[PDB]
Amino acid sequence: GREFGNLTRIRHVISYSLSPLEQRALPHVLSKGVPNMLRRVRESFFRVVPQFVVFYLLYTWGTEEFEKSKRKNPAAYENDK
Amino acid sequence: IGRSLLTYGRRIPLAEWESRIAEVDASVVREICSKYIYDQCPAVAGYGPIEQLPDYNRIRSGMFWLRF
Numbered sequence A: 001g002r003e004f005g006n007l008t009r010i011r012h013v014i015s016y017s018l019s020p021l022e023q024r025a026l027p028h029v030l031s032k033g034v035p036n037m038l039r040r041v042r043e044s045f046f047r048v049v050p051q052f053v054v055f056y057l058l059y060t061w062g063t064e065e066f067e068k069s070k071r072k073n074p075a076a077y078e079n080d081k
Numbered sequence B: 001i002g003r004s005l006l007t008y009g010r011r012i013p014l015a016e017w018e019s020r021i022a023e024v025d026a027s028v029v030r031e032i033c034s035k036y037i038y039d040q041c042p043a044v045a046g047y048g049p050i051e052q053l054p055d056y057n058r059i060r061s062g063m064f065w066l067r068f
């Protein structure tokens, strides 16, 4: 079936490659890779983060409320006698 | 004559070529083939419908045997 002899039909594309032993494995990290990671974080920040911030607010609120609910109310004894 | 005087500095007679040929033997072939072919990086060129031409790593790994 699917085999490297007849996958698709292409015309007029040229490629060039070096061998691994001719070139470096980690050529430019701090001059190219770091800024690229930075933009890659920039492009997705506001699509992911705010939902989790909202989750954090909800969690803390619900915890606080549950913990208030367990403390004794002075009006339950002071009001009528 | 012309090519020889440019490349070698001198005409090499057929007798000398015969003497050089007579010295080769299977041991010499083994040695020299190993000296230029075995575990080396090749240069490759392809033109045409060449989807099935193996990847360069696959070609490089074909230049040596694991059982040797």
Ligand SMILES: CCCCCCCCCCCCCCCCCC(=O)OC[C@H](COP(=O)([O-])OCC(O)COP(=O)([O-])OC[C@@H](COC(=O)CCCCCCCCCCCCCCCCC)OC(=O)CCCCCCCCCCCCCCCCC)OC(=O)CCCCCCCCCCCCCCCCC
Pocket (backbone or CB within 6 Å): B064, B065, B066, B067, B068
């Ligand atoms: C578990 C988790 C799973 C999930 C993980 C998730 C993540 C996974 C991600 C990764 C996925 C990877 C997928 C696989 C990729 C495979 C790639 C591939 O195949 O490439 C093809 C690759 C590409 O080349 P090609 O283009 O096809 O060209 C073919 C040419 O012929 C090329 O010619 P060549 O000469 O260059 O190479 C040929 C030769 C190259 O190999 C060699 O010549 C030797 C290689 C190094 C030495 C290995 C020797 C192992 C010997 C057997 C174990 C005994 C060791 C000693 C202890 C003795 C104990 C009594 O290899 C062979 O002929 C194949 C067999 C080699 C071993 C010989 C023994 C065969 C029988 C095995 C069963 C024995 C059971 C009984 C054992 C005794 C009793 C306990 O070529 C190969 O043929 C590669 C060979 C790979 C062999 C692997 C052998 C593994 C098994 C070892 C034994 C296990 C049993 C041990 C039992 C306990 C005793 C110790």
